[PDB]
């Protein structure tokens, strides 16, 4: 093929193909090893549906509730986009819990795969942070009173108790400043950190391969 | 029904097998048998189920926030129930926070405490398996109790 | 009662999973018959 | 708020998934011995 020759003599794409077609799947791998990849699929659905709603949502104490109501009744297929973003969030957490059960009960965390377990724990904390920040974006009765309790928990720690509460709320009490900071975490900070640790999680797996049989 | 047997005369492969690696060098070909034909089946099923639940069970609107009126009952997401129960049952504020932080901290120590043993099958790990089962029941017990009055935390309203 | 409904749905999910696996082995059995003879 | 359908699915898949993992582990245990 002329097209194949054009790329081959410049970038050497043949090396990539040979790497892919040299691997095998050992016979002790069963259907429960799919749970890791199902969790990734749910995350990609969140990115697609989450980005779409950024074209209509307004993060202000005066407009937040009304803008959400506008999406559910006026935008084309807005009812479907918002509902998927909510159901798919619960399914992502459920599949991650089952992924942990498979790893522990197959002994896939022992030497030399300790660091893969460590990077997984970080991904678990990041996933939980997505739920907390997004829970209060609508700014309704349930959302408003949930954030108020959560941001006050650190106050019990001596010395660094009160300063930590100040950083989370952006003030002494809950208000507009709290909403601005939570929106930034949900849409900019957390997505960036998740991408970095997912890459580390996958690079280690590919370098070492899957664990042995039982 | 296509499989490749391992080559046990290759010194390179034998070295990897002694270190717990090299298990992606025998079995069924990855391409196109698994990556091209089977993975798309899984992806389609995952998306279809989520779309089906959204159509049959849409979401609600709610009510605007009111800072002068506290709702009678408030709950977090379902996966925060086990730690939510702890927060409202331990009289000491400081003690409750320490217990919550010990969940992620406890997980980090698992690989470094079970390296004395060498097996992978659960039936060859009696003590480790028992601890795992006890922890699973405790977490379930706390989660269900979070939806009941505080006086039923220990008994769950039965026995 | 909310509790009654939740337990009804939980039992159905277990049943669906078992039927799914069982039907998978019926397809394998049919495939074997075709190739033979 | 109480989610009837969401809670039923969560409590239905955890017990069945755990049972399957123990069954496959047991079968490999007997053959190895």
């Amino acid at each position: 093929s002329k097209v194949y020759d054009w790329f081959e003599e410049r970038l050497e794409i043949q090396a990539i193909a040979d790497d892919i077609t040299s691997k095998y799947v050992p016979p002790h791998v069963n259907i429960f090893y799919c749970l890791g990849g199902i969790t990734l699929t749910c995350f990609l659905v969140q990115v697609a549906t989450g980005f779409a709603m950024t074209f209509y949502y307004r993060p202000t104490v005066t407009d937040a509730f009304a803008s959400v109501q506008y999406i559910m009744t006026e935008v084309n297929f807005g009812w479907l986009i918002r509902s998927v973003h909510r159901w798919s969030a619960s399914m992502m957490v459920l599949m991650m819990i089952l992924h942990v059960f498979r790893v522990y009960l197959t002994g896939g965390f022992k030497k030399p795969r300790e660091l893969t377990w460590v990077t997984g724990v970080v991904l678990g904390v990041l996933t939980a942070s997505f739920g907390v920040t997004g829970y209060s974006l609508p700014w309704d009765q349930i959302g408003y009173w949930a954030v108020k309790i959560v941001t006050g928990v650190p106050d019990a720690i001596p010395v660094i108790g009160s300063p930590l509460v100040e950083l989370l709320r952006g003030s002494a009490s809950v208000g507009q400043s709290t909403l601005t900071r939570f929106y930034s975490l949900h849409t900019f900070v957390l997505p960036l950190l998740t991408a970095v640790f997912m890459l580390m999680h996958f690079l280690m797996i590919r370098k070492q391969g899957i664990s042995g049989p039982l | 029904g296509v499989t490749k047997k391992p080559d046990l005369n290759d010194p390179v492969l034998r070295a990897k097998l002694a270190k717990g690696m090299g298990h992606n060098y025998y079995g069924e070909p990855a391409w196109p048998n698994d990556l091209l034909y089977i993975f798309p089946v899984v992806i389609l099923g995952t998306i279809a189920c989520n779309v089906g639940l959204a159509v049959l069970e849409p979401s609600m609107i709610g009510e605007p926030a009111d800072p002068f009126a506290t709702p009678l009952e408030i709950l977090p997401e379902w996966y925060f129930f086990p730690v939510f129960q702890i927060l409202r049952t331990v009289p000491n504020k400081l003690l409750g926070v320490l217990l919550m932080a010990s969940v992620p901290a406890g997980l980090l120590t698992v690989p470094f405490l079970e390296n004395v043993n060498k097996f992978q099958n659960p039936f060859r790990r009696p003590v480790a398996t028992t601890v795992f089962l006890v922890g699973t029941v405790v977490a379930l017990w706390l989660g269900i109790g979070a939806t009941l009055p505080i006086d039923k935390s220990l008994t769950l309203g039965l026995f | 009662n909310a509790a009654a409904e939740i337990f009804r749905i939980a039992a159905v999910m277990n049943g669906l999973t078992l039927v799914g696996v069982a039907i998978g082995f019926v397809l394998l059995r049919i495939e074997a018959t075709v190739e033979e003879a | 708020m109480i989610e009837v359908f969401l809670f039923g699915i969560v409590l239905g898949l955890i017990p069945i998934t755990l049972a399957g993992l123990f069954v496959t582990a047991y079968l490999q245990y007997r053959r190895g011995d």
């Binding site: 039982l214 | 097998l17 099958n121 | 082995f25 | 496959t24 190895g32």
Partner: peptide, 26 residues
């Protein structure tokens, strides 16, 4: 051959190694 044996063969593939093999315990 028998019905019981047929099911056991495909629940877990019989062509796999086992962790008790001397080669894996080198």
């Amino acid at each position: 051959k028998s019905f019981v044996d047929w099911l056991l063969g495909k629940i877990t593939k019989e062509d796999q190694f086992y962790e008790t093999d001397p080669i894996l315990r080198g």
